[PDB]
Amino acid sequence: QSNRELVVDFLSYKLSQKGYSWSQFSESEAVKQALREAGDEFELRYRRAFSDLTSQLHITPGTAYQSFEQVVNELFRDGVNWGRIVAFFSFGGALCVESVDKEMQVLVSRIAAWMATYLNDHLEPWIQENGGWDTFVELYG
């Protein structure tokens, strides 16, 4: 629930950084801010990798979900940590941005939905078992 709002917040931020508006495609504030900031740091320290993140996926509305699912399953196959979670959001951001660049606007809301569902079913259990998001804020804020 607030997981959905987390996802929309980060994606808005990343979209806004490239001149796009979320609106065109559709405490807890300490968690958002920290995530925004971690994602920025991620994208900065690995700017090269990130300049061409999703190019080689050849995203289409038909293949989108399967590309997304394959990447996220591999990313977490052998475990979760906070940095991998950050990679996850940053990945989602790159994916949205590319969609719009490529004029596949429809994908943005879907991607948001996929991340929200993945977060709820696959990550939140680890998150609770590991302190909740308030821990994230402590370590990465």
Partner: peptide, 26 residues
């Protein structure tokens, strides 16, 4: 196969970022 390389990359980067934030925590 291009999805493997990406997530391998994603995994490598995130694990490193996470490493650093652990060194800081000490």
């Amino acid at each position: 196969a291009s999805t493997k390389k990406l997530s391998e990359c994603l995994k490598r980067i995130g694990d490193e970022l996470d490493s650093n934030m652990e060194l800081q925590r000490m």
